[PDB]
Amino acid sequence: MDIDTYKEFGATVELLSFLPSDFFPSVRDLLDTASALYREALESPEHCSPHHTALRQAILCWGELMTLATWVGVNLEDPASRDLVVSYVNTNMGLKFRQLLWFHISCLTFGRETVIEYLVSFGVWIRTPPAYRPPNAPILSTLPET
Amino acid sequence: MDIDTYKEFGATVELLSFLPSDFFPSVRDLLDTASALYREALESPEHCSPHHTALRQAILCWGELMTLATWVGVNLEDPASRDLVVSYVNTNMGLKFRQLLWFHISCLTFGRETVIEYLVSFGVWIRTPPAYRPPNAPILSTLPETTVVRR
Amino acid sequence: MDIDTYKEFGATVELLSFLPSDFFPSVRDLLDTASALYREALESPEHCSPHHTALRQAILCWGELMTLATWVGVNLEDPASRDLVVSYVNTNMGLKFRQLLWFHISCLTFGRETVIEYLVSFGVWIRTPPAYRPPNAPILSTLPETTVVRR
Amino acid sequence: MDIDTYKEFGATVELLSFLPSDFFPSVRDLLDTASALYREALESPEHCSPHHTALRQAILCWGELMTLATWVGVNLEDPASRDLVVSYVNTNMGLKFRQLLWFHISCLTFGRETVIEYLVSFGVWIRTPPAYRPPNAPILSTLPET
Amino acid sequence: MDIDTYKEFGATVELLSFLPSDFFPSVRDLLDTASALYREALESPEHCSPHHTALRQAILCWGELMTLATWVGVNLEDPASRDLVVSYVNTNMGLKFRQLLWFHISCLTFGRETVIEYLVSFGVWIRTPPAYRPPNAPILSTL
Amino acid sequence: MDIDTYKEFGATVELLSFLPSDFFPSVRDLLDTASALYREALESPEHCSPHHTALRQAILCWGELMTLATWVGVNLEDPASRDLVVSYVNTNMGLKFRQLLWFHISCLTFGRETVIEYLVSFGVWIRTPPAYRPPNAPILSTL
Known part of the structure; x- marks a missing residue:
């Protein structure tokens, strides 16, 4: 149906692919971040x-997807095919899901405009040659200056 | 976690368990209904x-999931494993998706209070034993079954 | 060019894909209905x-298409190919034209809002398994359900 | 001269052929209906x-036409030709005359607009497939609802 | 019914009989013009x-009709009859369809009054005997 | 990206497909016209x-591109490949560049609406069958 996940949130699949693929945290770390910060709001009976x-x-x-991976591991006898399917589920779809989780957790934490401008700034930074860019990689943080 | 996707809107997996498993239309039919009724709104950049x-x-x-099915059909050599994975993706993972699609398309078309009242009434109807169960099962509609609108 | 006939009219080619093939009268009955209800308006020099x-x-x-069918029947010596082409023209394209004629006649008769609500409710009905839907399909008519014309 | 019987009354030969040919009552039943309901008005010295x-x-x-049929029966010796002429008079012209009688009696009884909309509704009903039309055939009646 | 599709647009089949049969562009050229000029309005969900x-x-x-032609080319084993019917669908019906496409695209582009005056003037030009007929046939132009 | 340089100027590649490939003047003639008419404004330090x-x-x-062609002519010892690539740079890319130069010089000279109407009218003229096509092709003129 040609639907974009982010364009209602002001981003784009291309804008989130403007960052390196290995920049996004692991799916486990992102799920832990969500459960630590917004569990009581993600389980509440409100939109919010x-x-x-x-x-x-x-x-x-x-x-x-994880229940599918478990079912494949349990109900597929072929080790090569089982491993290929599980590796696909963990890598190919895992990358898209950690892009999604990073985007939404980071929006909820730091602000949507802040996250989008951070995407732009980090994408330009990773492409600027080293000798002519600020030396520290950009980062998001709620800790105020002292 | 225990999100329970429907309780954000006002139902539960237990309230949608009143409907049998085979009550829900095919995923193709539900995608056709979505693309027919709400395509321009599902493609817009707005929070509708x-x-x-x-x-x-x-x-x-x-x-x-369908791209995963295409990929397994293309890249898995073992035919038994390939067909097992594709059948699982199409049936077991598809059932929950047609439940979710039915709930959302119906809640959009007819309204949330109406869909909830319909779920309760269909629970009553399917609970009644078959001997005392009327033939007219409850149904969601915006027009009466007979629409005598002369012009 | 990816043109939708009904999108201009607020329907969609897949909104009307739920009406079964036997839902529509024959092309002859639909043309008779058109020529008997709106002939003096379809033959007028005005945009109505x-x-x-x-x-x-x-x-x-x-x-x-009818002239094409008679031309095939007259100029094709092969009975097999002749009847194959004639039957294709009469069934396959006949179905699309029955659908189109029905949509336009029913719009002109009942109102576009009414016919679109009816299409929605009939889709809801036809998507339900036969065991969970009322046995009487929703009806679109200018007549009361008792079909008695008083006054 | 290209004259239409009904177009002064708001109908058309095609609109009355939009109904089945066997729908219209017999000429005898229609003449009985006329003589029962409007004899004192069809014999009065007024238009009305x-x-x-x-x-x-x-x-x-x-x-x-009926006096013609009687004259044919009496003054034609050939049985085949006599029977052909009488059958023609009774069927071919009888159909047009019972269409005419039905239209005019029904107008006088139920209202002209009511009769025309009934013609339209019955013509659409007889053509709608059975499973998607109301089950009872339409009918005209002056009996109010109780 | 004798509906005469152009009667509502102010023409007739008698008025479009002024133009010869081989005057109208091909269906491919006409669909190319339509897609180039009015595609975004022909895909729009509005009565424009x-x-x-x-x-x-x-x-x-x-x-x-083209779906019919493809279906015939695939499902008619008889080559002679198949080619006969495909040639019919391409020429005999294509003529009327390029008449219709020409009329509607030209109306949309130039104006209905302009197209009707062009029909009248082309009738004059094609009626003039060959010795007194200017070599520049009438043409529709916004320039 | 499908940027389609003419979309901002109100044309498309579909609209400029009406004109044949060999309709456009040579790159030399187009650069001559540009230098003759708008040199003082093309050297100006202003968004005109x-x-x-x-x-x-x-x-x-x-x-x-011409600097590339000269560099190739000097630094490619292989004569066959050298001539192949110079001919490519002159014809295959020169075609698109004379399309672009024609469009922009003609817009500057005659008006954007005038150029678009000329494109439509030239489409009509090239679609007309040869028997009913006037011998005077459409032309852009201020006279």
């Missing part, structure tokens, strides 16, 4: 945000 | 409603 | 409505 | 309606 | 104008 | 108009 709705849907979708 | 957000997410996850 | 315009174009296309 | 005028003319015309 | 409605109908009708 | 900006860009891009 488009970010909360999208994050609920993404978490449940990843849970279904 | 929580149902639109959840529907975009669900359609994209189903697309991801 | 987009439904009138589309219905004139549909009637002219069906006329071209 | 275009429907009364057209019905008077139609009744007299059918009477002339 | 009766010409847009009739043009959508004509384009989808020609698409149905 | 989007056509001036695009024309400066196109002229410098063709200059870079």
